[PDB]
Point group: D2
Chain length 493, copies 4
Amino acid sequence: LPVLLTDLKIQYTKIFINNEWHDSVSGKKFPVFNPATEEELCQVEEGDKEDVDKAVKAARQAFQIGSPWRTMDASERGRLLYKLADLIERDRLLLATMESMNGGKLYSNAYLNDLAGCIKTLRYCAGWADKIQGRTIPIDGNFFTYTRHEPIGVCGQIIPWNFPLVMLIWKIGPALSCGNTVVVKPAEQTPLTALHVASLIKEAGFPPGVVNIVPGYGPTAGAAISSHMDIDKVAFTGSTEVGKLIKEAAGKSNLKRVTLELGGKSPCIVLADADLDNAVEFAHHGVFYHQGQCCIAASRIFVEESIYDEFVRRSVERAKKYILGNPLTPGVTQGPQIDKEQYDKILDLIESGKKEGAKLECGGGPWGNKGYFVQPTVFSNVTDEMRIAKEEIFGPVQQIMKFKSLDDVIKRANNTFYGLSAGVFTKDIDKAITISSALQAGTVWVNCYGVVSAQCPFGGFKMSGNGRELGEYGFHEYTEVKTVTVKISQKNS
Amino acid sequence: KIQYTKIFINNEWHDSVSGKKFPVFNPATEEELCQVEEGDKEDVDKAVKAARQAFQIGSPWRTMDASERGRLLYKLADLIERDRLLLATMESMNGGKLYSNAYLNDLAGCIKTLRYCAGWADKIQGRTIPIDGNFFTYTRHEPIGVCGQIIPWNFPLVMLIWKIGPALSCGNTVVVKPAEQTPLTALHVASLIKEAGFPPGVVNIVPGYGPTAGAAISSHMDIDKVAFTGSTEVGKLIKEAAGKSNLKRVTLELGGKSPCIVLADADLDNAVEFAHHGVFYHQGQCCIAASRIFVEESIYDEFVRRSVERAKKYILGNPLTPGVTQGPQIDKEQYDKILDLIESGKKEGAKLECGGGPWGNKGYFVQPTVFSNVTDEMRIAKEEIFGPVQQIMKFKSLDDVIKRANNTFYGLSAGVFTKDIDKAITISSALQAGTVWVNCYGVVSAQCPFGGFKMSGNGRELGEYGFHEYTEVKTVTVKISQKNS
Amino acid sequence: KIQYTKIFINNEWHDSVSGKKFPVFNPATEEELCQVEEGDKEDVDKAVKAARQAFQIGSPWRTMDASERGRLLYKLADLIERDRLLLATMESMNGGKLYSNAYLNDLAGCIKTLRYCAGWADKIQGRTIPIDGNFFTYTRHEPIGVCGQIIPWNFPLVMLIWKIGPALSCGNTVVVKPAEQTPLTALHVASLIKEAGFPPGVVNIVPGYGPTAGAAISSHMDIDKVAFTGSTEVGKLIKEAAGKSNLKRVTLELGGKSPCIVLADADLDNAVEFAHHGVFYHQGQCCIAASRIFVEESIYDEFVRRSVERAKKYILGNPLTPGVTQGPQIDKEQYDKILDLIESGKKEGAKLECGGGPWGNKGYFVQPTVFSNVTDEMRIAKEEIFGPVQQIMKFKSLDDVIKRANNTFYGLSAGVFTKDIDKAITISSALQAGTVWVNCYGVVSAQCPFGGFKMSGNGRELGEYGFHEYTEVKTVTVKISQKNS
Amino acid sequence: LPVLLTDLKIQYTKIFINNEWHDSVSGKKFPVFNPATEEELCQVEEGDKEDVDKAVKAARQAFQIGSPWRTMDASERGRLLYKLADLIERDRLLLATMESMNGGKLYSNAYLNDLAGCIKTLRYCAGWADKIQGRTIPIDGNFFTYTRHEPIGVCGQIIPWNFPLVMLIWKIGPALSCGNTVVVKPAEQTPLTALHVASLIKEAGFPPGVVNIVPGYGPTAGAAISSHMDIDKVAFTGSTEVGKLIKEAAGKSNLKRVTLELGGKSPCIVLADADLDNAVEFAHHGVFYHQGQCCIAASRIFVEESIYDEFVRRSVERAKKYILGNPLTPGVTQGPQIDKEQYDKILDLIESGKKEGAKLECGGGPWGNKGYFVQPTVFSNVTDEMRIAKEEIFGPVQQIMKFKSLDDVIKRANNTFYGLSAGVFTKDIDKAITISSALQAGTVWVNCYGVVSAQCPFGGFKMSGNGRELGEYGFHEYTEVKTVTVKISQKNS
């Protein structure tokens, strides 16, 4: 049961460099608002290329051969990450309340889900710390060859605003586990929890400069990170347009490694032989979790004809019960979106869906005078041609298309440039495996949705990202392989 | 013809130390083909001496390239494919295996296993450990040494390959002791091993009798590993001998009574066909025989009716004849034991449905016998038969039938038939079996590992699991000046 | 004080079925601390019943999350760190281990092993196989079941952790049988296990005597695995019992006579210090003792001269005293055997250099004895001593000394000292030892696996190698409609 | 012993699409010359964006779910690759003669080193075919999660000219092993062996469209491949500038995966306690193998103060004996370079080194009236500031710098933006491991050089490439991970 708490005091608003808090060299500060009330919470230091460089220099110094972080035992890095997780669990109340106040997130999920996944992921990576290993290779000839999975180096990391803490942890878990030093750039919407976790990183005992944080804007600080020459990798999570921009900036400068996590118009096929109650509930959760501001949101609910009507009749009823109010309230089940821009975008896309001809089965429009709230919306009889059926809405808008044959739905779901996720709802053994094989998605769920843990990898296929995270897969993308071959007197099998 | 009936050591053929020769009989007509030298303690000792000379540091084999070992294995597989017809006919005659089963399933499987183990030769790898302190630690996979391999008669060639291919791919020297019933295929494969280009002494064969030759291999001090694939009593006797001498590594693959759990949602045609095959494949002398074919009540009477019908179409005849789908058994002892088990099942009240007795005084052929209404205290459902005998038991609840299938000391394999994702996953995890099939049975391939959960097995095969069994892990730690991530 | 001296079953303390209690003696003064219940066949049976109830499908432990299992193990490690002082003092008193060795090396190593095995809980994974045909095949790592663990006295806590941490991380229920000499630490750790929050029946302890309790564990039908870490005779007696009952899995870690090969190019100071430590660490009762410390001729007389000098500075006294670098032995039998071995070495002509006899009638203390000019037929170089006895042998050629070091039935570990890359790699790859150190000795860590190459062990530990030992592999093949790459 | 060669007949000069030979839709044909004699060998069809597109269409069709290549067993793909290797071993004579005639490569190394490496790599990948495996993940909650390492899709591949056959095999080994369909674009200098191997691919029995080959130019066909939207990955090997261009073209469109293998300026540190004969011989081989046209060429030979003068004295002697004639002639040890462009570039860089002040101790000028021949050149007293000490020469020009302390040499070797390789020559156990750890290179050799086998991975750290090849590592690059999660009734440990 979450303790309500209902209070905060944001004493951390600076740039975290060299285990120290510095104002931006420019001196500017930008405001961070509260989505529920639109009131400024505080003024966070505004970093830019100069501050990004001042942070990358410290990171590079921390990564020098002979520095504590390099001569640190892998088990010691794991122990430091575990102590950070313990410190976060100690401050789970404050961090959850900050996430709900500043990210507009429901406090119940901010405490029970997001903070929980944060500690779980931090502990998973702390465990992996001293278990990533190389291989001794059976090379031909009298040679002894092995591989070192060394840290890549300086890894700039660009966090989104939808899951500030969870994504911060997803980034600085594998990176610090594998021995790298990072310069994180958090979203301007949600820069506060990252700074508190930065203070916690200092407290846990990480060497100075191992983790630095630069709050700012994407064009100024994110672009500086992605174009920096002294940065060895960039790991960006966000929109596909900024993903292409990050890839470009990396390719132009110092040919760094790039790891993009982009959006997706994920489908949710619901076959005739599906558990209608479970299918309906999980479709609702998939498309409406976190005000639809989830990269894996089920934005294309395919339903077979034989069960279409029922499904709609049961989806609307599920979307009509969705309480919507102040996040710090137990009865509230939907909160404000993030800020004005996404709120307006969701409203505009709702209007576009209405115009195109998609049956508005649930109320599409604002709720309340104060805050960026949108009514849970449902569209029926949607077709693949409509904008709402092709563009990532990132809002609480549910599309419901109808199909007849299975191969038709396979083609329709694979007929897109997004490949982040997909869902299949059936009781059969053949349909499940067939559709899971045929669906071009980096994570196919069967009879569930939104099921992510630190263990299994997460990523996209076509344009929904590059590489994977969350596991051995996620860790091998934060290491550079070095083959060391030694000429030896004689080799025996 | 059989031009190889001797002891294969140092790439050369030798007669037994005693000079004794035992006969090999074709069960289809019991006309002995040739006399094969009887391996005894002295023959085992000299074969092991040859192998240990071949494994010595600096020898051609130890200094050979793992890629070159795989290339040698691929050469051996291609030569075996060249003479596929001869080996197929010789296996079918010696063991009675149906010619279609001996050619399209046995030799193809041997080739696939050899070409898989050949592929794994230079890809098996050790690991570099991030140890604590200023040390550089790494581990390496080394061949263990001499591998005494005991290959009973149900699958002579396939088991010989399952035994050597992993061993010759991991870089071990094999002293294979075949079955007295079917020793000829191993000898011909040894001749093909010589043709392929293996260094002398890498592969040695010592045909004989298990009580004398196999026991000698299992007790030998210089045999690093013993790998037996056969009866559980013999596996118990090999394990106790292995511990007493050398604390040698032991890998025992024993047969088992394996359930096939059929549910109402299962496709009845596929379920019937696969339950038929999983028990009558290779005339029942299969370590994976589906001996406890459970069925749901709702289709119980509908299953047997169809199942029995299939048993009535199972043509019984000489293996080389076309249109025949079954052959004779391996010898007279198995014939007598099969008839004894059938009589015991009749006595204990197992309702016979079809067949149920011997046939064809010419040979060791047995009619496909289908029982019914079998229970869990009968000795035809708990005693391993190794014969074409089906036991169509019954159940009503899923947890109780799971406890039934797991109510046994035998866990080599299990089967499940269900059109429901939830049921399939629940049953496969629940059953205590090394291989749990779903909607199919006996789908064995070189990639998927093979072992047994209970007394039925020890260790794994056929994959990256079957290649860490033939190797030792040697850890090397070096004190370095200063370690960096 | 010792508030835990009973049998730990179902998270509760029980007295023995017979009611008998055996004594535990501190070797430093031989004043018995407390009486510990004697585990017998009935106590082993009830502990195994508790464990098998804890391992049942649907139980809290089986349905627990692997990540949650790791979290439980981390809680256990943190609690053990909370009471580090109590456990360190209790280990030092009960076993005589030096307090510095008991605190800064024993408890720290226990914590590191627990926090490594905790990390491996949810990262061990099975694999999806590209099988042939229209089938989907995958494999999974299932805990094997009940793990009867026999933990002799040289490293009670470190070995108990090396035994359970892997088991509780792979999801197995442990019935640990400690050493009669040092059973108290296991009981206190079981109390801390209760405090941590393990489900009842996951961990059970049955202190007693090996001939009665350990044999009962090794012969029990429901014990899936037996893991013994001690003398080779007992290892052989456990292996033969293991095969006879249940065909249970056997993991034996036995001590060995391990060489330390010192060459002229080696740094003489480091070589002397590490040869000293590798044999006199923990007063010689170390399974890895560097018992065959070879030396090159060019520095031979220069090595002993310095080596002996170090032995003369080795302070001998009560473990809890500061400035002491050695403690007493484990009991009177080891004392008598150490003196017998010293007398035999003197009789056979091993040139004594320093010490060479008992000391301190108060306790079981022994002077550090350094022999010299030892050879390969003497019984102080081929018989495992488990005492502070060094055997400074000699060699001239590299191949012959390699054959010497490999001239033995014991291969647990080996050592090499050389400032030459080529020599280091050549010797490391040449030796038939499962852990070859270079320029160092006894650098053991939870990451690097540990095992024996010969009769000095079987299986591996401490790493992914030591976590596939506590698990089975279950293949699961599903017939699918159409497979695509 | 190379089997003596016979006169050639180049009967394969077209575009290989759908297991068929088609002229370029434009109809143009470009000439391929013989570097030793500058005579045109034949006119190879000139592909462009249109031919690349009509090849990618066939590749995509071959990759469709339900096509033979998709329903092919992994063991069957390995069997087909093994049959291709058998065919190449059968035609080893012709292929080696073609490689030597068209690539200017010595026939002895073309037959013993290059063709042997090709068959070994093809057989290694054919072995891996059905052994690349996913993982069943221990996900939290009652879920059954596993992973499929599916083929990425269409993989455009751009081969260089220095190792035509070896690089063609390095590309189409892991790709076809993991189940992908490829559109290879070979260098215009060396397009002939690729086309013969294409005919061999057809003969072995690969399904139509699985492998297609488009001979053309980098700006026209290579850029088309790297900018195609229907292509899922691009794997380019060549210069760093074109690597940046490939990364850009991938980032601008399709957000495809990119694998670059670029050049390097690799150091070869020779310490005082080194086996001077072996060190000198291997330095010569490293810098002069394949007329210096090796990506891993030892272009910076660091020598310690104590053994410098002697090292120069014997390096000059070793380089003075390097017989230099027509490749097909036995006893020749150096041949023509590739074509006029690289010949002129090497001459210009030699002149720049002369002007800067590096002492020319051997060679340093053209050779022969016919053919692109350069005398083995040796520079001494080089400094890190000179152009020859910073720019990849790619010719038979040897640089020899002097150092005193090991720290100095570590920094100097790590003072470049290239990270492809490095070499260390010492007898000690501490120096070897220390320098191998400290040197920022994707392949450190100790007391040897140029030691590459199919097993161990190959790649570069900073700007010498992205990712790795040649082993399980190469395979991870060529597969997309798909996590399939199924909600189950109950899960047990």
